[PDB]
Every structure is written in C-alpha cells, then in structure tokens.
Amino acid sequence: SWAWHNGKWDWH
Amino acid sequence: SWAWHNGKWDWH
Amino acid sequence: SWAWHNGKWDWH
Ligand SMILES: [Cl-]
Ligand SMILES: [Cl-]
Ligand SMILES: [Cl-]
Ligand SMILES: [Cu+2]
Ligand SMILES: [Cu+2]
Ligand SMILES: [Cu+2]
Incomplete structure (x- = not known):
C-alpha cells in the first residue's frame, strides 16, 4: 500500500 | 498481486 | 517495484 516517509x- | 479474501x- | 527476470x- 502507499506509505508516507x-x-x-x-x-x- | 491481487488476492481474494x-x-x-x-x-x- | 517492477523487477526484471x-x-x-x-x-x-
Ligand atoms: Cl508527497
Ligand atoms: Cl470483489
Ligand atoms: Cl519485457
Ligand atoms: Cu503497503
Ligand atoms: Cu500478490
Ligand atoms: Cu519491488
């Protein structure tokens, strides 16, 4: 899934 | 890949 | 990610 970092x- | 559940x- | 094989x- 899309992740934020x-x-x-x-x-x- | 796409899965079914x-x-x-x-x-x- | 896309891979080559x-x-x-x-x-x-
Ligand atoms: Cl962003
Ligand atoms: Cl469905
Ligand atoms: Cl190809
Ligand atoms: Cu994810
Ligand atoms: Cu899969
Ligand atoms: Cu990858």
Missing part, C-alpha cells in the same frame, strides 16, 4: 508518498 | 479482491 | 518485467 520523509514528506513523500511511495509504495511501502 | 472474504469476498473482496485486494492487493496481498 | 528472464527477459520479463513484472512486479517483484
């Missing part, structure tokens, strides 16, 4: 939304 | 199709 | 591009 360091300001960015990307696939996990 | 409890009547629903969702990513695994 | 045996000439084909598919999800990992």
Whole structure:
C-alpha cells in the first residue's frame, strides 16, 4: 500500500 | 498481486 | 517495484 516517509508518498 | 479474501479482491 | 527476470518485467 502507499506509505508516507520523509514528506513523500511511495509504495511501502 | 491481487488476492481474494472474504469476498473482496485486494492487493496481498 | 517492477523487477526484471528472464527477459520479463513484472512486479517483484
Ligand atoms: Cl508527497
Ligand atoms: Cl470483489
Ligand atoms: Cl519485457
Ligand atoms: Cu503497503
Ligand atoms: Cu500478490
Ligand atoms: Cu519491488
């Protein structure tokens, strides 16, 4: 699923 | 891949 | 992510 990390939304 | 569970199709 | 294997591009 999409994840959020360091300001960015990307696939996990 | 897409999976089936409890009547629903969702990513695994 | 997409991966390459045996000439084909598919999800990992
Ligand atoms: Cl973003
Ligand atoms: Cl369904
Ligand atoms: Cl290809
Ligand atoms: Cu996820
Ligand atoms: Cu799958
Ligand atoms: Cu991948």
